[PDB]
Amino acid sequence: TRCLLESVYTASAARAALQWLDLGPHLLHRRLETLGCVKTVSLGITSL
Amino acid sequence: VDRWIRHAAGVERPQLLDTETISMLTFGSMSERNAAATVHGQKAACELI
Amino acid sequence: FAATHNPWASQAGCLSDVLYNTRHRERLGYNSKFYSPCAQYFNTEEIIA
Amino acid sequence: SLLHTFWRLPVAVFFEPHEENVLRCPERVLRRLLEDAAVTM
Amino acid sequence: AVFFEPHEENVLRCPERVLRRLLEDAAVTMRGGGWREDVLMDRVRKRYLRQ
Amino acid sequence: METHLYSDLAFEARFADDEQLPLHLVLDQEVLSNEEAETLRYVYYRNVDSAGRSTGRAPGGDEDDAPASDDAEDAVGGDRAFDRERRTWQRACFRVLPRPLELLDYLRQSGLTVTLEKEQRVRMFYAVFTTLGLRCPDNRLSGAQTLHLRLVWPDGSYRDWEFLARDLLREEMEANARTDEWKGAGVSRLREVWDVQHRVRLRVLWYVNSFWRSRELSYDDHEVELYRALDAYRARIAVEYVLIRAVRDEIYAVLRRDGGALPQRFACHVSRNMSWRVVWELCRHALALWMDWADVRSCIIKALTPRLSRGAAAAAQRARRQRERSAPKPQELLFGPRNEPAEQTWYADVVRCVRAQVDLGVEVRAARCPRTGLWIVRDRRGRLRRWLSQPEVCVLYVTPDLDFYWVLPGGFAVSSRVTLHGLAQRALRDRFQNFEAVLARGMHVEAGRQEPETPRVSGRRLPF
Amino acid sequence: EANIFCTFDHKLSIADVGKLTKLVAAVVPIPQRLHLIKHYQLGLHQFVDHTRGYVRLRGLLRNMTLTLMRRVEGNQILLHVPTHGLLYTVLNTGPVTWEKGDALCVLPPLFHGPLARENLLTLGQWELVLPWIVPMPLALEINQRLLIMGLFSLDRSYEEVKAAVQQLQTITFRDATFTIPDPVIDQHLLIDMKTACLSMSMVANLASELTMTYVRKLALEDSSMLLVKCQELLMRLDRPQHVSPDDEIARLSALFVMLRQLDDLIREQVVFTVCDVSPDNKSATCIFKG
């Protein structure tokens, strides 16, 4: 599933997030805050 | 030779950019600011050899 | 009915194809915000589709 | 003869087939093996 | 019970250096003879001497 | 009968270029087992002269000197010498009759007419038919010429039987439609012949209607030519054992180089109150016992066998080229494709001093365990074999490269290399070069797929 | 007799019987000409096996009888086995180009190249894979290339045969591309190689002393393109005394029966001859049996 769901995360912003998850001198959790769950998407180019 | 070619080209140094803002700049970022005045409009050019 | 009237700017792997086809521009690192007007003429992995 | 360790304090184990234990031959079996290696040639 | 853990830095020092001297003296008496080529060679040469 | 006559006419056909005279042979249960005879794929055989080089390579000299060069990228000489060694052997004809039989009875059931000097009741468990052509360079023939046999099973294994041509032509030259005349004339005598090592005998046939009988070759067996042919056979055998000599002097060098304080490179729990004078003494007593039991079937020979392959040298260059590169640039990781050493197959020499039973060829899959894990040695089934706990063992580990570990009980190890620079190259190939698969019946055309069942021309079924 | 019925095990939803009515005047191989068969002996999936061989499939497909598909009724499908010389309509599914006046025969489904894998009738553990209906030039080319690729691959290491196969496995015919999945050495393949070697050597014995040296005489006289192309390989190989013409007649008659026996190893029986084709190439009328 790691090679599977990476093959759908191919765009630039996804791998940019993957880079920013490992390009810190800190650890992960102090840079992470939770927001909740999505219930409706609008299919834009910047999707609402 | 990079310092000399920046002096001869007019564009200054890359200002020792942050190692995280390179990912910003490859993600996409507007860098070059406006001029002081424009009596014509926006500029446009490109080059081919 | 010649072969190519600009052999420095047409082959897969020339100067202009490595400068303006967006795949190699991503392979070198570039501002995506900068509009390059030759990108519409060298995007050969998009007009091929 | 005695080893030079890194940790000052030894620990315990649980006898898995995964943790690589040292030999259990307390005092008689090693004397048996040295007598063996003496009389083998 | 009582077991140390496998680090990298933990070593085994020399066994009062006389047993390593015995390894060297075993090497110098191993050097003369014991090739294991010559037993096969005189076997086949006595075979072709007997035929 | 089926291969003898055909390859006789075929060597009559091809006699003009390479003057190969046929040797019509049959084997038995002394040569190989019944299971090995049921699935024998094809046979290779090699003509090698009294000087001892080859019949495939160059007459004077070769690009196969400059002894070993101790490299990884070429690692023998590259694959041109592998092409040479493929061109040495020839693929002779081959036929198996896997059913118990009497041989003279079987030639009586065929059209062949048998007459020997005295009736020798030969009875064996099966039959495999093979013909060999030894190449006389001129019309004349040298007595100290020697042969080679290779028996190939589809797993990739091989067995080498070698012997001189002196015992093949000892009594024979001293006494000395075509398919219809061949049966009417038939055989003159049957002769068994051992090899050079007396480990296996095999029987040869002699037909009077062969074209060998009318060639009128000359036969001479000079003693100084026999003296050098055993010397060439000496170096051919010695390629396996002086390599074991090269391992042992490396240990004695590095231990004098270190000074007796050897480190740990393997994960073992230890115990400080256990004595270590007893452990050092069992190092010396068992190390010589490994040399007493050295054999070609060993770990250090199995370490070399993937390196002497076809696609080994270019892939070995691809290994360092993947390592010796720059770190991936920030422009690379966002738009380049995804970029690729988890566990490796090691081979092991397990010696045991309590019972003097030493195991030579052992598959070991070893990998770096986490949290500064030095090394841990599992089996093919994740068994974590746990011999190196015990006081009774000592173990030697080799890599697919020439890296080398001699490990004491308690997992304390000696890290060194394998030096083969004293070994020449042309004897390093011909003993154990990894030979390639050649396509036969039931083989897939493309290189490797789900392979079907074996052919197995056996006697439990009918042929059909 | 001719009308045979095949029942099913699963139930029928509307999409499955719709896909069945999409297969009116299709073609499905049946064994034994049984009057009633299950759907497991239907089609080809009972005999398909990857990494088993293309040649054994090409053999045993030709031995099963052929039928057409029409008149679905529910929990049964009617198959009408065709008779000799009668005019039937055939709906192809193998996307090869058809033209009028052209002969047709049946090959097992070589995968197309994108691996479309269009089962076109879905079940759990069984699919109705369809036989290809291929015109005689392409099928004869497939047979000839399979025989050549079988003959060259003997006593060869993997590299040279791989370099020759990656070109030789491809084939075009009216802007198409095909490969051959399971080309393995089989016992039927080896006995056909044996038959080819015996027959071709018998041709080699039955040549007269003028028909062996006719091409040298033309290379002496003329110089044409096919002359040079034949003479190139011919040189890579390297007045009439008595003319009794009846002996040349008998030699050529023996050579004719030997060339027929050689040619039969690749050329099958023609099992369909078209009459007219629809321009969308999805159905055509054919006058032969199965």
Coordinates of N, CA and C in Angstrom, one line a residue, chain F residues 44 82 86 91 310 436-452 464, chain G residues 50-52 149 153-162 165 181-187 190:
Chain F
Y44 N 28.5 -31.9 -21.4 CA 29.6 -31.1 -21.9 C 30.8 -31.9 -21.8
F82 N 34.7 -15.3 -20.2 CA 33.5 -16.2 -20.0 C 33.1 -16.7 -21.4
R86 N 33.0 -20.6 -22.5 CA 31.9 -21.2 -23.2 C 32.3 -21.8 -24.5
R91 N 28.9 -29.6 -26.9 CA 27.7 -30.3 -26.5 C 27.6 -31.6 -27.3
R310 N 27.6 -14.4 -16.2 CA 27.5 -13.6 -17.4 C 27.3 -12.1 -17.0
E436 N 26.0 -20.8 -18.4 CA 24.7 -20.2 -18.7 C 23.7 -21.3 -19.1
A437 N 22.4 -21.0 -19.1 CA 21.4 -22.0 -19.5 C 21.3 -22.0 -21.0
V438 N 21.3 -23.2 -21.6 CA 21.1 -23.4 -23.0 C 19.7 -24.0 -23.2
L439 N 19.0 -23.5 -24.2 CA 17.6 -23.9 -24.4 C 17.5 -25.4 -24.9
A440 N 16.5 -26.1 -24.3 CA 16.3 -27.5 -24.6 C 14.8 -27.7 -24.6
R441 N 14.4 -29.0 -24.6 CA 13.0 -29.4 -24.6 C 12.3 -29.0 -23.3
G442 N 11.1 -28.3 -23.4 CA 10.4 -27.9 -22.2 C 10.9 -26.6 -21.6
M443 N 11.8 -25.8 -22.3 CA 12.3 -24.6 -21.8 C 11.5 -23.4 -22.4
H444 N 11.3 -22.4 -21.6 CA 10.7 -21.2 -22.1 C 11.6 -20.4 -23.0
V445 N 11.1 -19.7 -24.0 CA 11.9 -19.0 -25.0 C 12.5 -17.8 -24.4
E446 N 11.6 -16.9 -23.8 CA 12.1 -15.7 -23.2 C 12.8 -16.0 -21.9
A447 N 13.7 -15.2 -21.4 CA 14.6 -15.4 -20.3 C 13.8 -15.4 -19.0
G448 N 13.3 -16.6 -18.6 CA 12.8 -16.8 -17.3 C 11.3 -16.3 -17.2
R449 N 10.5 -17.3 -16.7 CA 9.1 -17.2 -16.6 C 8.6 -18.3 -15.6
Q450 N 7.4 -18.6 -15.5 CA 6.9 -19.7 -14.7 C 7.3 -21.0 -15.5
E451 N 8.3 -21.6 -15.0 CA 8.8 -22.8 -15.7 C 7.9 -24.0 -15.5
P452 N 7.7 -24.8 -16.6 CA 6.8 -26.0 -16.4 C 7.6 -27.1 -15.7
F464 N 6.3 -42.7 -24.3 CA 5.4 -41.9 -25.1 C 5.9 -40.6 -25.6
Chain G
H50 N -1.7 -20.0 -18.9 CA -0.4 -19.2 -19.2 C 0.8 -20.0 -18.7
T51 N 1.9 -19.8 -19.3 CA 3.2 -20.5 -19.1 C 2.9 -22.0 -19.3
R52 N 2.2 -22.4 -20.3 CA 2.0 -23.8 -20.7 C 2.3 -24.0 -22.2
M149 N 11.0 -19.3 -35.0 CA 11.5 -19.0 -33.7 C 11.7 -20.2 -32.8
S153 N 15.9 -21.3 -31.8 CA 16.1 -21.3 -30.3 C 16.8 -22.5 -29.8
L154 N 17.1 -23.5 -30.7 CA 17.7 -24.7 -30.2 C 19.2 -24.5 -30.1
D155 N 19.8 -24.9 -29.0 CA 21.3 -24.8 -28.7 C 21.7 -23.4 -28.8
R156 N 21.0 -22.5 -28.1 CA 21.3 -21.1 -28.0 C 21.1 -20.5 -26.6
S157 N 22.1 -19.8 -26.2 CA 22.0 -19.0 -24.9 C 21.0 -17.9 -25.0
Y158 N 20.6 -17.3 -23.9 CA 19.4 -16.5 -23.8 C 19.6 -15.2 -24.5
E159 N 20.8 -14.7 -24.6 CA 21.0 -13.3 -25.0 C 20.8 -13.1 -26.5
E160 N 21.3 -14.0 -27.4 CA 21.2 -13.9 -28.8 C 19.8 -14.2 -29.2
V161 N 19.2 -15.2 -28.6 CA 17.8 -15.5 -29.0 C 16.9 -14.4 -28.4
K162 N 17.2 -13.8 -27.4 CA 16.4 -12.7 -26.8 C 16.4 -11.5 -27.8
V165 N 14.4 -12.4 -30.8 CA 12.9 -12.6 -30.5 C 12.2 -11.3 -30.3
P181 N 2.7 -14.7 -26.6 CA 3.0 -14.8 -25.1 C 3.8 -16.1 -24.7
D182 N 3.4 -17.3 -25.1 CA 3.8 -18.5 -24.6 C 4.5 -19.4 -25.6
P183 N 5.6 -19.0 -26.1 CA 6.2 -19.6 -27.4 C 7.0 -20.9 -27.2
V184 N 6.8 -21.6 -26.0 CA 7.8 -22.5 -25.5 C 8.0 -23.8 -26.3
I185 N 9.1 -24.5 -26.1 CA 9.4 -25.7 -26.8 C 8.5 -26.8 -26.2
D186 N 7.7 -27.4 -27.1 CA 6.8 -28.4 -26.7 C 7.1 -29.7 -27.5
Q187 N 6.5 -30.8 -27.1 CA 6.7 -32.1 -27.8 C 6.1 -32.1 -29.2
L190 N 8.5 -30.1 -31.2 CA 9.7 -30.9 -31.6 C 9.4 -31.9 -32.6

